[PDB]
Design a protein around this ligand. Sequence first.
Ligand SMILES: CC(C)(COP(=O)(O)OP(=O)(O)OC[C@H]1O[C@@H](n2cnc3c(N)ncnc32)[C@H](O)[C@@H]1OP(=O)(O)O)[C@@H](O)C(=O)NCCC(=O)NCCS
Ligand SMILES: CC(C)(COP(=O)(O)OP(=O)(O)OC[C@H]1O[C@@H](n2cnc3c(N)ncnc32)[C@H](O)[C@@H]1OP(=O)(O)O)[C@@H](O)C(=O)NCCC(=O)NCCS
Lengths: 195, 195
Amino acid sequence: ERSSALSEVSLRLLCHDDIDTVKHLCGDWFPIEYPDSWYRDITSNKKFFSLAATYRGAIVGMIVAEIKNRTKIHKEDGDILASNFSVDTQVAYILSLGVVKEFRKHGIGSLLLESLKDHISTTAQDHCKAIYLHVLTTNNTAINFYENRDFKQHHYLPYYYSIRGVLKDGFTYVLYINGGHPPWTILDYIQHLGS
Amino acid sequence: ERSSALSEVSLRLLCHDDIDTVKHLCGDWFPIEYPDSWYRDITSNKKFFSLAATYRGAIVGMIVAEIKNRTKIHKEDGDILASNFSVDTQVAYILSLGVVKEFRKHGIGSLLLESLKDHISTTAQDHCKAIYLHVLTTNNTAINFYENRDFKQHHYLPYYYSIRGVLKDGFTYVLYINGGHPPWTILDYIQHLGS
Ligand SMILES: CC(C)(COP(=O)(O)OP(=O)(O)OC[C@H]1O[C@@H](n2cnc3c(N)ncnc32)[C@H](O)[C@@H]1OP(=O)(O)O)[C@@H](O)C(=O)NCCC(=O)NCCS
Ligand SMILES: CC(C)(COP(=O)(O)OP(=O)(O)OC[C@H]1O[C@@H](n2cnc3c(N)ncnc32)[C@H](O)[C@@H]1OP(=O)(O)O)[C@@H](O)C(=O)NCCC(=O)NCCS
């Protein structure tokens, strides 16, 4: 019924007209209060690669990412890349990846991810050295999907409580590309030089 | 009427019985959703210095702070102290400082702050090197109060949007004590050595 769904899937960019759909689908995945401005920006601003997967013409999945230089990484994740990667080095952050529950396990998520990788290759060549993202600790399904796709769990991010707001805990997950890697400790060097 | 209010003010620790009052007063200052567990912890856990100011026996102000080693500072604020301050160095973070609006400008906030400074001296001696806190960009009144009290604006903290949650923008404000200072740049050294 839905069994054949991948054969009826097309890829397109998000656009302003998609905002209400995007609110609905994102809200289903994640209980978080993004402002309208966030939705307008991700849907309409070319700084983002925002790609939808449609089934029978209706969005059933999306990936939203930003390719940016390493200085734009928030300090909590600054150490995803070693210091010997210069300030000009690029990374891609995945703001959102999701697929509608009924449509999961048909290969849509993988297709979206692959599409982003292709986009990175054409757009940034070998300059981009990591793709990174955040997952809630609770998301067993997502973690499995990413781990199976070579993403590594970089570190735990704790609950954050402040006047500015509250953040749930999470993990940063990173796929390294084009030779990227995290900072190396004394032992890491001892190993490479040693052996 | 309220004019004489400081003469009728007493200081006491927060306790479990205060939680509903604390929710009410904090909520009036800040629009943020702390979980019940946060309130239980700040009211009852001795890891925190949580001090209330009462007028006619009722809480009209409070300060909540935690004295902690520097490794416990979140990475966004790691650079409040220079690297030559060892890992054993302590800082105090102010989780909350507020006074009920009608009772403001009677000296209650200053008293709470001074009390924390006294607590730090007896508790940590000269080991604590900074007191730091966060304010929303919107808080003109708080900024004035802190700036007048020698706190410096260390840096801007941007809006944060993620699956984990949303944070409003803010500033980190720091008072240095016992010789504490931020990292020094090449020019900063050139100046000290130079002149
Ligand atoms: C993680 C997620 C995106 C995966 O999407 P999918 O669309 O489920 O991804 P895929 O279908 O490509 O892969 C899922 C599994 O199905 C398998 N699969 C793909 N097609 C299949 C098929 N036709 N028949 C059987 N299995 C299939 C894949 O091999 C994969 O298994 P593997 O990891 O063992 O290889 C999805 O679980 C999700 O949207 N979760 C919500 C995550 C979230 O909260 N994201 C951000 C919040 S805004
Ligand atoms: C910042 C804040 C705590 C200050 O409290 P206060 O109780 O107002 O502080 P004080 O009364 O000590 O000082 C306020 C001013 O009144 C002056 N003052 C004190 N007593 C006075 C008096 N009796 N007559 C006239 N002025 C007086 C003080 O000198 C000070 O002015 P200055 O900065 O020019 O010196 C208060 O504005 C507040 O609670 N703001 C909300 C901040 C917030 O959101 N905090 C965290 C959110 S959880």
